[PDB]
């Protein structure tokens, strides 16, 4: 019979790819369908380029793709419209904001699988040791805490110890970190939903200069090459007070044998001042049936399975990844494992989106401009004021003649 082939999450990021292959195998065993799992690179932008090779070729060699929240506007021609396959009631079981995101010119491109939001991870043992009772609410507090704890831990002999790790590599993860910096300083959304390119302002420039100030001081010099996992590995070894990352890091840090098991909490990222908005960049992944799949019915069945209550439950409980079904946030087992899902649900609901809706199919070009200009501030090549001016100009060229 058919072999249903899935290009799914990466085995290079935590347990995601191992787990996803397990889920696909479980579906194949349940239904008596042969399956194959095709692995992917760690970084989202590398995955997009890989999958574009298959799409350009109209390739039947992958049936189901796991796609980023920022992709529907790019990938829609390559997606089978799922709308006819779901009842209205079935679709309403997902958060409507994500279903809207996944719907392009009426085409339901993909089902919501897991959501994501940037959060602050903090070592609670170390805050207590150094006389702090709460995690930082402002970026200045984060810097002050990081300086004090670093000084102490270095003096105590840990030469590997840093105050803060984050994603500073030039890739899509930096666009996520940078949107959080800019929005949390009152600097806007880089490109507003209305199309206004707003990033050339003093608040956005300040946010970027602040981030530069961390590099080689409270964050490692090498943070300019860090993606999710490079940040996570410094943190997980016990060598960072703070980390910015996504929810998946939580289950991994609690695993038996983790040096930091039981020693951390999570909270919203800090902001410049009490009247700035909280920033948590919206992330998350969706499930797309290929327009080029020879087996649409089987592929849809697999996608509905992976997006189901019990598979999302398993993702929440085992991998601390955020469901796209509101019902799961009241499930007793989800909440007993991850109590912080309730504490931060409003942070996740208020997450700030990258400008993928307004940039549509040009989003990847926009994002490459963002991360390259931000990276130039981090590396010290440019100051934030010049970088936001230069980024404004770049994005203006990219979006010229694009209407949404
Ligand atoms: O790097 C930006 C990218 O980060 C997140 O995707 C991670 C995800 O959290 C992991 O659990 C895993 O699946 O790998 C992903 C790719 O690194 C966001 O979900 C995604 O929206 C964002 O673009």
Q: What are phi and psi of 306, to 5 degrees?
A: -60, -35
Q: Which atom of ligand 1 lies nearest, measured to the CA of 285?
A: 19
What whole-number distance in Å separates Cα of residue 3 and Cα of residue 112? 24
Each domain of the chain, given as residue ranges in start order, spans 1-116+283-350, 117-282+351-404
What whole-number distance in Å separates Cα of residue 63 and Cα of residue 299? 6
What whole-number distance in Å separates Cα of residue 21 and Cα of residue 221? 36
Q: Which atom of ligand 1 lies nearest, measured to the CA of 68?
A: 21
Distances (CA, A) of 216 to 157, 213, 222, 266: 18, 8, 8, 24
Q: How far apart are the first and last CA of the chain?
A: 43
In this structure, is the dihedral angle defined by the CA atoms of residues 384, 388, 394 and 399, taken in order, positive or negative? positive
Helix (H) / strand (E) element for 323: namely: strand 322-323
| Spatial CB neighbours of 26, under 8 Å, sequence gap ≥ 6 | none
Residue 339 DSSP SS3: coil
DSSP 43: S
Q: Which atom of ligand 1 lies nearest, measured to the CA of 9?
A: 13
Distances (CA, A) of 401 to 56, 113, 265, 357, 398: 24, 33, 46, 16, 9
Return the structure tokens found at 31.
């239904």
Enumerate residues lining ligand 1, CB below 6 A: 9, 13, 16, 42-44, 68-70, 116, 172-173, 176, 228, 246, 248, 283-285, 321
Return the structure tokens found at 163.
């105050």
- Residue 32 CA to ligand 1 center (angstroms) comes to 31
Quickly list DSSP for 281-318: BEEEEEEEEBTT-S-HHHHHHHHHHHTSHHHHHHHHHH
Q: Is 170 left (phi over 0), alpha (psi -120 to 50) or beta?
A: beta
Q: Give, for ligand 1, the residue of 50, 116, 249, 318 to mutate: max count of ligand atoms closer than 8 Å to Cβ.
A: 116
- Residue 242 CA to ligand 1 center (angstroms) comes to 19
What whole-number distance in Å separates Cα of residue 317 and Cα of residue 313? 6
- CATH of 117-282+351-404 among 3.30.870.10, 3.40.190.10, 3.90.1150.10, 3.30.70.2610: 3.40.190.10
- Residue 156 CA to ligand 1 center (angstroms) comes to 35
**Contact 32/298 with Cβ under 8 angstroms?**
no
Tell me the β-bridge partners of 65: 7, 288
| Spatial CB neighbours of 277, under 8 Å, sequence gap ≥ 6 | 183, 184, 186, 271, 352
- Residue 1 CA to ligand 1 center (angstroms) comes to 33
Q: Whose CA is nearest to atom 20 of ligand 1?
A: 283
What value, to the nearest 5°, has the Cα angle with vertex 346 and ends 344 and 347?
65
Q: Which atom of ligand 1 lies nearest, measured to the CA of 319?
A: 11
Q: Is 105 left (phi over 0), alpha (psi -120 to 50) or beta?
A: left
**Contact 327/347 with Cβ under 8 angstroms?**
no
Q: Whose CA is nearest to atom 12 of ligand 1?
A: 13
Residue 122 DSSP SS3: strand
- Residue 44 CA to ligand 1 center (angstroms) comes to 6
What whole-number distance in Å separates Cα of residue 214 and Cα of residue 196? 30
């Amino acid at each position: 019979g058919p072999v249903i082939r899935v290009a799914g999450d990466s085995t290079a990021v935590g347990e995601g790819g191992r787990w996803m292959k397990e889920m696909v195998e479980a579906w194949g065993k349940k239904t008596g369908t042969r399956v194959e799992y095709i692995d992917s690179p760690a970084d989202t932008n590398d995955r997009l380029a890989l999958y574009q090779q298959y799409w350009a070729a109209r390739s039947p060699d992958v049936d189901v793709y796991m796609i980023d929240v920022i992709w529907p506007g790019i990938v829609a021609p390559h997606a089978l419209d799922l709308k006819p396959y779901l009842t209205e009631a079935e679709l309403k079981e997902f958060f409507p904001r994500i279903v809207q995101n996944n719907t392009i010119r009426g085409k339901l491109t993909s089902l919501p699988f897991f959501t994501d939001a940037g959060i602050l991870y903090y070592r609670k043992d170390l805050l207590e040791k150094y006389g702090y009772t709460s995690p930082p609410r402002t970026w200045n507090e984060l810097e002050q805490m990081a300086e004090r704890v670093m000084e102490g831990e270095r003096r105590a002999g840990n030469r590997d110890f840093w105050g803060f790790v984050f994603q500073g590599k030039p890739y899509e993860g930096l666009t996520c970190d940078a949107l959080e910096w800019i929005y949390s300083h009152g600097g806007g959304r880089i490109v507003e939903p209305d199309g206004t390119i707003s990033v050339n302002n003093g608040r956005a420039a300040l946010a970027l200069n602040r981030a530069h100030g961390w590099v080689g001081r409270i964050a490692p010099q090498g943070v300019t090459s860090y993606a999710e996992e490079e940040a996570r590995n410094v943190w997980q070894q016990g060598n960072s007070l703070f980390m910015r990352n996504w929810p998946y890091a939580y289950a991994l840090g609690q695993a038996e044998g983790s040096p930091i098991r039981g020693k951390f909490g999570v909270t919203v990222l800090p902001k410049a001042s009490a009247d700035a908005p909280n920033a948590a960049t919206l992330g998350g992944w969706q499930l797309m049936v290929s327009a080029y799949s020879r087996y649409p019915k089987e592929a849809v069945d697999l996608v509905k399975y992976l997006a189901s209550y019990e598979v999302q439950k398993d993702n929440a409980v085992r991998l601390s990844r955020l469901p796209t079904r509101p019902a799961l946030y009241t499930d007793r087992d989800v909440l007993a494992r991850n109590p912080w899902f309730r504490d931060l649900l409003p942070v996740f609901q208020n997450a700030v989106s990258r400008p993928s809706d307004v940039a549509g199919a040009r989003y990847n070009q926009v994002s490459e401009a963002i991360w390259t200009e931000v990276h130039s501030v981090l590396t010290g090549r440019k100051k934030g004021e010049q970088a936001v001016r230069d980024l404004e100009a770049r994005i203006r060229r990219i979006l010229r003649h694009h209407h949404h």
